[model samples]
Target: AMNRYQALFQRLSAAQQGAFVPFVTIGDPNPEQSLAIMQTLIDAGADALELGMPFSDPLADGPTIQGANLRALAAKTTPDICFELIAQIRARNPETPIGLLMYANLVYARGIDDFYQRCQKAGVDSVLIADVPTNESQPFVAAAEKFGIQPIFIAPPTASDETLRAVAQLGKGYTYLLSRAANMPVHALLERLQQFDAPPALLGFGISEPAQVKQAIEAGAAGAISGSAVVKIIETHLDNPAKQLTELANFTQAMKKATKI
Candidate 1:
């Protein structure tokens, strides 16, 4: 099962830094604006995008992302609308890769086989389900491989040798390494991942600030995942969507430069 991220990784490599994968739920402010924000991030040089599948309860996200999810939910965003937003995103920014971020409940509710099939059709290159355990991912791993969607898993600081090995075996696309255990914050976990194995880690969870981005790379990660931080920037400019887009681009460029240098 060849995943769709092969080309995406190549593009990240060409940029001369690890990678910047930021997560945002569809319709966080509104669906239409989310489409624009996606384009803004790509044009501003984000290596990849994590489009979250909005749920009433995002068990893994912290206060900031959880609040954004509520706002997006209030705007009438649903699972179907999430995929529809991707179609609109592809209409303009087709080159930048998108990975669906969701929970196992929604995925299971949709049925495993149907889920992966829909993901491939929607032009989504990969997926990240927050709560799924790597060793117990038989159905998702099999179906995702069958449909050509890269299914990635996470590893926290508590991960033991056995845990890292399981992550190495079950993981594809890249291994998401959590910087700390306190949910997800920008300032928390800005240190090296000396505990885990060298399985092409991407530091995530609580990675919002630019200094934290460089800190993660310095810890030997292949990239960083900015969730709360990026969303915070967008939230700040929500009153002025135009300014929001501009600041988002600038933030992405500044973070990328800091990570590389």
Candidate 2:
């Protein structure tokens, strides 16, 4: 009953609908205003949230997220800050599943097993280490599973069928469908993913528009993740901090409705 991502699917079943999992960096502009932005996203109907751990080098991020990460890092965001933010979030919305989006190096540096224990204690439902390959990931995955944390993997279009099968075998919570090429935005990659069948794939990476989201849902995906687009909205309204939450909420609602239909 407490299977984090599976529990998410159960909630979606209750709605008689699919899920829309969204991600955004905490402390993008500053820490004081981050709670409001998160609340807005949840209220606007993001089924689950992936709270980003801003590393000095987010190798897989697009321009928008990379920029946001840099801004947050300048704001002094650290691996610990991401957990503290999640702790604050757990205080208000305990039922909403939260995942940590971080780099393997960060976790490895902190000691992988220790990282899992920390995340579990902080109430993180899952952890998605973007660059963790399937072969190199077994020990980390085993440790997280031991501590009751789901270690999600990202599968790109360029991945071989063998790679996909390997992921399907090892991936427990959800396989992150990296729809676009890493570190850049190209809308055409959406069409390339249509050729594959990844049951319950959670599409992510450079997915910005309602069309892309709709395509993901229509292609047998269980969920879609919108990161750069949401981060861009926050960047646009940085000067008017109070109004930015409204922008984020409106965009999240729009994306959710578009895909749910």
Stretches off by above 4 angstroms in model 2 are 58-62, 181-199
Q: Cα lDDT for residue 4, model 1?
A: 42
What TM-score fits each model?
0.86, 0.87
Predicted candidate 2 versus true structure: per-residue lDDT over 34-110, tens digit per residue: 77788788889988898787766656565888888888888997778777887888788888878778877888987
CA lDDT, every model vs. true structure: 0.76, 0.76
Model 1 score (lDDT): 0.76
Model 2 lDDT-worst window of ten: 181-190
In terms of lDDT, model 2 sits at: 0.76
Model 1: worst 10 consecutive residues (lDDT sum): 186-195
TM-score top scorer: 2
lDDT per residue (tens digit) for residues 1-261 in model 1? 334456655555686677887778788898989888888888888887888876776575668788788878889888788888887777677777788877898789979888888888788877877887877887898888898877777777666566666666666677777766333342222232233333456788777778778877766567888888888887888789999898999989987776685
**Superposed Cα RMSD, model 2:** 4.3
